[PDB]
Structures are given as C-alpha cells and as structure tokens.
Recover the amino acids of this structure.
C-alpha cells in the first residue's frame, strides 16, 4: 500500500532546497501519494524511465502538467508535439526533427562557436560578471532568436514567455495563476512571430514554414510548431548553460579537469543537465489499468515524474550528488526518454558544448563573488543571478 507524503514539490521551500525532499520522495516507496495535490508521484530512476518508455500506457495527450485535458480546458491550444500521442505525434515530431537534425547543426555550428568565443572574451575584459544574465541568458539570446529568424523587437518577451509556459504545467499555485493573469502581452508577441511573414529566410521558423509548401503540415499547424520552439527553445538552454557554469563554479577541481582536456566540454555539459535537471518534472496520464512499481493504478490517473530525482537516484548512479564530467551520462532523463525525448537536444548540446569549450580554453578559475539568487518556477530549476569573478588563462 502506497504511502502518503505531505511534501509539496511546487512550493518555494522545496525549490530552495529540493534534495532532502527528493530523497524522502524516493525512499518512501516506488510510487507515492502527494496529499498536497491528490496525485501519484514516482521519483526513482527505474519507475521514471519505464513510464517514459510506454507512451501507449502513459499518454501525454491529456496534458503533461497537473491539469487533465479530458477534465478541464487547456490554458492554451495544446502543443501539436508535447501534448499529443503517437500517431498524431509522429508527423509533427518527424518535421521538427528534420528542422533540428545534425545536418542542420553542422551549418550553424561555426557561428555558434565564434559567438561563444566572443562572449567569454568580453566577459574576461570586465572581471565581475553575472553568470546568469551576462552569459546563461545572454549567450542563447545572442544565437537562438537569430537561428530562429526572429526580429529584433519584442525579444524581451521570450524569457517571460518561457517562464509562463513552464509555470503553467504546475498545480494551481500563486506562481501559476499569477503567470496566467499576466500572460496576454506575451502570447500576442509570440502569436505574431509565429507567422511566415515574420520569419527570416533560412532560419528554423522559415524552415518550418516550408513544410507548408510540400504539405507535410497545414498552415494552421505551421504557426504552432514554431510556437513549440518559442516555448521550449530558449529558457531551457538558459538554465542548462546556467547549471554548467554553476557547477564549474562550485567544483573548481572539475574545472581544472575540463581545462586539462577541452574535449570533455560536450559531456561536462551533459553531466550538468543530469546534475541540475533544468526541467524538473512532467506528468503523464494512464490510458489503462496498469501495474506500476507493485501498485495497480487505475485508468486515467495522473502520475508526476521526478526527472531531477531520477537523475540523482542512488539506485542508478554512483555518487549521484557529485559533479563528474567524465561520468558515463548516457541514460539520464534530463531531456526525457523515448518517443517524446527532446527533439531540441542537438541545439542545446551545441550551445552547451561551444560555450564550455570557450570556457575551457579561456578561463583559469571561476569563483562566486557575491549573493546567489534562485528563480522559482513550477517546472524549471535555475538561478536568477550568479555573480562570478572570471580569472583569465
Ligand atoms: C537545456 C536544454 C533542454 C532541456 C533540459 C530540455 C528538456 C526537455 C524534456 C525533458 C523533454 C521531454 C518532454 C516530455 O517527455 O514530455 C523535451 C522535449 C521537447 N523539447 Fe526540449 N529541452 C532542452 C532544449 C530544447 C531546445 C533548444 C528546443 C528547441 C530548439 C527544445 C524543444 C523541445 C520540444 C518541442 C519537445 C517536445 C518533443 C516531443 O514531445 O516529441 N528543447 N525537452
Ligand atoms: C521542453 C518542454 C516543452 C516542450 C515542448 C513545448 C511545446 O510544444 O509548446 C513546451 C515545452
Ligand atoms: Cl500561447
């Protein structure tokens, strides 16, 4: 029989220090009942990974946040890709995949590295820098909206927009409800840049709109796939990169390790995604009666998956609380797993690698010199400010 926990994985307290709670979450039982929100949760690597790889049983089309789309109105029209099941998923999925293939990365790869090299140089010129706003936020801001082919004007909405989207997967918090109350300007901006007339020749939005021509997607579909990349494509990478730098900061020996061997960049990043897990949690909904870690769970029940917890399960990882940039990271669920696994992963790693590469060649120490402020959001873990003094090589 399934234990009750009073933990609220969406309270400021939990965000501020999740690690003791996530350990109660695991130790309690393979499946737990969260009184705060009347839902089942699963925090161990094994359970999380299983749920992820049975989309037939654990569907996403009833929402991947708490809210059940069968029971209640989605807060916005649903994603053609996040909030759908195969087969409706498979087409929109395949398209975004071509858009963001390794072929594509090869073409934009030099540009991303050069821009990464430029930021780290400028930063070394100043010394004291905010690792979040001046790097984590600034770098993908200098590469991604361009890769998208966004205009200049409006971009200040891209981050609040992400925040809104990720806050909304959560329970009906103060966090959620406020985000929603404040959402109109952010949606109008995104709705606008979602249109073909507004996407520069040769960028993702443009490349996406091309699938209109051949018919792989309709014109209603097209603005909505773009919408996908404008929700998911930015703040994720802000927090990913954010994690990496914070890790390097807290783990100076691991920085020295990376400097010794700069080819360890890609994986020092991947490790950071495991170790922080910028995207913390997602739900599914049972499509049938299913036995899940010994419990028989009824049809149409929501299950909360602790991604971060999975990624830090002692049952799966030696010394999981450690930053180890030569860890065999393969199998972490930082970008999820299976049919829905992050279609954007190549862009993220692209950014995380070039930037960690630039750092490994350019910086000799990263020390935090200041107050460190966390940002609170229902789905995203990350920092709001991280003051560091960069010392040059
Ligand atoms: C720090 C980098 C990133 C992280 C940690 C991350 C996280 C995730 C996770 C955990 C999923 C699985 C969702 C699920 O199982 O329901 C996912 C899927 C997705 N990601 Fe990412 N992501 C990142 C970067 C990106 C980027 C750069 C893009 C756009 C270029 C993107 C676009 C998407 C989209 C559209 C999906 C839904 C795919 C599907 O359901 O088939 N992500 N991401
Ligand atoms: C990375 C999480 C995420 C993935 C896809 C969407 C979307 O399709 O709007 C929104 C969020
Ligand atoms: Cl929207």
């Amino acid at each position: 029989t399934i234990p009750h926990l009073a933990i609220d994985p969406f309270s400021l307290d939990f965000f501020d220090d999740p690690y003791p709670d996530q350990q109660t979450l695991r130790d309690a039982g393979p499946v737990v009942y969260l009184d705060k929100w009347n839902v089942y949760g699963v925090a161990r690597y094994a359970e999380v990974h299983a749920v992820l790889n049975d989309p037939t049983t654990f569907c996403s089309s009833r929402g991947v946040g708490l809210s059940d789309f069968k029971k209640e109105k989605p807060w916005r029209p649903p994603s053609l890709i996040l909030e759908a099941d195969p087969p409706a998923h498979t087409r929109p999925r395949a398209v975004l995949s071509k858009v963001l293939s390794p072929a594509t990365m090869k073409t934009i790869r030099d540009g991303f590295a050069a821009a990464a090299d430029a930021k780290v140089d400028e930063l070394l010129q100043r010394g004291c820098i905010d690792a979040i706003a001046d790097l984590a936020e600034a770098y993908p801001l200098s590469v991604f909206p361009d890769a998208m082919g966004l205009k200049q004007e409006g971009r200040e909405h891209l981050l609040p927009y992400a925040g809104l989207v990720f806050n909304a997967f959560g329970p009906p918090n103060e966090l959620r409800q406020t985000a929603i109350e404040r959402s109109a300007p952010h949606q109008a901006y995104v709705n606008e840049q979602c249109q073909r007339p507004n996407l520069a020749p040769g960028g993702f939005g443009a490349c996406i709109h091309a699938f209109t021509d051949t018919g792989e997607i309709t014109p209603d579909e097209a603005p909505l796939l773009v919408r996908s990349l404008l929700s998911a494509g930015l703040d994720t990478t802000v927090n990913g990169i954010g994690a990496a730098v914070y890790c390097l900061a807290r783990f100076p020996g691991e920085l020295q390790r990376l400097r010794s061997d700069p080819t360890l960049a890609r994986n020092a990043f991947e490790e950071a995604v495991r170790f922080e897990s910028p995207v913390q949690t997602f739900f599914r909904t049972t499509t049938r009666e299913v036995e899940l870690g010994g419990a028989v769970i009824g049809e149409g029940e929501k299950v909360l998956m602790f991604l971060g917890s999975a990624n830090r399960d002692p049952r799966r990882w030696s010394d999981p609380d450690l930053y180890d940039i030569t860890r065999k990271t393969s199998g972490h669920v930082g970008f999820g797993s299976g049919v829905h696994m992050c279609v954007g992963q190549l862009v993220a790693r692209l950014e995380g690698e070039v930037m960690l590469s630039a750092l490994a060649r350019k910086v000799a120490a990263i020390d935090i010199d200041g107050p460190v402020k966390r940002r609170f959001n229902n789905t995203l873990r990350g920092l709001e400010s991280l003051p560091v003094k960069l010392t040059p090589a």
The pocket of protoporphyrin IX containing FE (ligand 1) is lined by residues 60, 64, 81-82, 93, 96, 100, 228-229, 232-233, 236-237, 240, 273, 278-279, 282, 334-336, 340, 342-344, 347-348 (CB under 6 Å). The domain at 1-393 is CATH 1.10.630.10 (Cytochrome p450). The chain has one domain: 1-393.
